[PDB]
């Protein structure tokens, strides 16, 4: 038996769906979202880490000249200096006083621990959310793990569920992402091959275990000072470290809708937005025949107390008469008020009491147990407390009923003014038609 509903994408909300087959007693399903997980698709662009400058020991040619040889190394530098007269601990070598030459060489490399401490630059698109939903009805509990797109069906107790695509297409991630350890940043990184010295991406490597490396760190060499061997050079400090010290905020601490950003794999957990359409197909064993169900007539409801707090702050007493003791399935037919339970034991005494949660000054909703119906109206008061440690248990509907105190005052005043205006117009038209009839 095909049925369809729409239920909110909020974790811990007690959603109850009423399935009312004409020949059978209605039943109520309780669906709850234990958690969600919205995960994007990633294309690794490159990997960044701290660099390491390799400076070989210099080549000093005594009584001669040397010539520089080019090499294919990242950010490679080589020069020759003439007129050197170096020294050692024991004496000055290169016996020729002024006909000597030094070859200075330096280049840059990926650090020794780049496979343990590095940042990854990604492009993120086409998020896909999973979810985990607890479904209970009749006498089945039990929690399933589903894909929220209309392309996955799960069976609970012989009932076939499909949780359709999310109402919104909102994702907290931008197009470009930087992931470091357990932290995700909405960053606009430089492309591959166009990094800059001193900032993020001065050295770029395509993959953790790749062999290529692109380096742009502004390395330079200088003449050694006379009488000593040191190969002096100057270079802009690492861009990865200056990124670490000044990356700025994160997405873990900043994302909207209060959703927890985690990594490995990158995902955004419990990120309350949108609606989830649900399509269900039930067997015949789920329902009960109308013969063995109790029959109830003459139903009225009255509210004992109401206070529109976040918890279940309204109490409702409901009277009837029944032929035999049994069990019925209650439901509230408006989202202005949310009931707490889905089934109620009916007895010959003729009273049941139910607790509901609301958020409006005057609700008016129709409540049914088994097959009967009744309209409940209430006059509700604000709570005294200011702050609570738990989420709202209602649907946050605030517009009062048309029969509430305030909007009934509005009707009375507007009706009086309208009657006055109608009398004015009638007097004027009567006078005009008297003038015309003559």
């Amino acid at each position: 038996y095909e049925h369809s509903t729409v239920m909110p994408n909020v974790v811990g909300f007690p959603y109850k769906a009423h399935i009312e087959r004409p020949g059978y007693s209605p039943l109520t399903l309780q669906m709850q979202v234990v958690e969600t997980s919205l995960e994007p698709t990633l294309n690794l662009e490159y990997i960044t880490c701290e660099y390491k400058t390799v400076v070989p020991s210099p080549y000093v040619k005594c009584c001669g000249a040397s010539e520089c040889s080019t090499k294919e190394k990242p950010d490679y530098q080589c020069k020759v200096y003439t007129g050197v007269y170096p020294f050692m601990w024991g004496g000055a070598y290169c016996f020729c006083d002024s006909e000597n030459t030094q070859l200075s060489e330096a280049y840059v490399d990926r650090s020794d621990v780049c496979r343990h401490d590095h940042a990854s630059a990604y492009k993120a698109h086409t998020a896909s959310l999973k979810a985990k939903v607890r479904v209970m009805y009749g006498n089945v509990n039990q929690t399933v793990d589903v894909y929220v797109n209309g392309d996955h069906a799960v069976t609970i107790g012989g009932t076939q569920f499909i949780f359709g695509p999310l109402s919104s297409a909102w994702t907290p991630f931008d197009n470009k992402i930087v992931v470091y350890k357990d932290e995700v940043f909405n960053q606009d990184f430089p492309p591959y091959g166009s990094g800059q010295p001193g900032r993020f991406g001065d050295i770029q490597s395509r993959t953790v275990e790749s062999n290529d490396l692109y380096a742009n760190t502004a390395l330079k060499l200088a003449r050694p000072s006379p009488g000593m061997v040191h190969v002096p050079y100057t270079q802009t400090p690492s861009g990865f470290k200056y990124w670490l010290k000044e990356k700025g905020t994160a997405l873990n601490t900043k994302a909207p809708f209060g959703c927890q950003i985690k990594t490995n794999p990158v995902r955004a957990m419990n990120c309350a937005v949108g609606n989830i359409p649900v399509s269900m197909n039930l067997p015949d064993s789920a329902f009960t025949r109308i013969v063995e169900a109790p029959t109830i007539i003459d139903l009225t409801c009255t509210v004992a107390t109401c206070t529109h707090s976040s918890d279940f702050g309204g109490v409702l007493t409901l009277t009837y008469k029944t032929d035999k003791n049994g069990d019925c399935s209650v439901h509230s037919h408006s989202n202005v008020a949310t009931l707490q339970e889905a089934t109620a034991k009916v007895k010959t005494a003729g009273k049941v009491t139910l607790h509901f949660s609301t958020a409006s000054a005057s609700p008016s909703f129709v409540v049914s147990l088994c097959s009967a119906r009744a309209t409940c109206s209430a006059s509700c008061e604000p709570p005294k407390d200011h702050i609570v440690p738990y989420a709202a248990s209602h649907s946050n509907v605030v517009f009062p009923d048309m029969s509430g105190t305030a909007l009934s005052w509005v009707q009375k005043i507007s009706g009086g003014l309208g009657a006055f205006a109608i009398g004015a117009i009638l007097v004027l038209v009567v006078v005009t038609c008297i003038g015309l009839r003559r």
Binding site: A255, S309, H386, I387, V398, A406, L428
Partner: protein, 156 residues
């Protein structure tokens, strides 16, 4: 690593005041978990006192190495509903204090326009019905003079 001390929490109207006592520089951050959040991070080094907003959507704060703590405000106000018309407006101004004034001004303006138009129509009708008899020295028709309050109370 150590665990920071639980701050002292004081509840206000859509606000929380936290008293913070660190032993060593500890990081304190918070965010409003609605559609457009209110971010903040800070490195607290001395004993201080902070005020942070808690809307109906909720809030959370992360203090030190502790787990983050979420807090939700509740639809509380100071007007008294189901009373006189001047208390319902207070009640609906305490919560949503931006559309209540707009709606009340609109309703009051509409009522004023209606009442002015009605009074205008009566004035025009009386002028129309009295201008013909006022071009001749005629009787006021004491049956008409009593029913309609015209300019001459008893003079002709």
């Amino acid at each position: 690593v150590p665990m920071a001390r639980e701050p002292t929490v004081i509840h206000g109207k859509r606000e929380v005041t936290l008293h913070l006592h660190p032993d060593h520089p500890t990081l304190f951050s918070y965010r409003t978990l609605g559609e457009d959040p209110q971010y903040h991070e800070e490195w607290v080094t001395a004993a201080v006192e902070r005020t942070i907003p808690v809307p109906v959507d909720g809030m959370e704060y992360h203090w030190g190495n502790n787990d983050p703590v979420r807090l939700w405000s509740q639809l509380t106000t100071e007007g008294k509903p189901h009373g006189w018309p001047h208390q319902i407006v207070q009640y609906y101004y305490g919560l949503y204090p931006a559309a209540t004034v707009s709606a009340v001004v609109g309703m009051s303006l509409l009522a004023l326009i209606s009442i002015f138009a009605s009074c205008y129509m009566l004035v025009a009708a009386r002028s129309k019905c009295l201008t013909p008899y006022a071009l001749t020295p005629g009787a006021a028709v004491p049956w008409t003079l009593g029913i309609l309050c015209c300019a001459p109370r008893a003079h002709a």
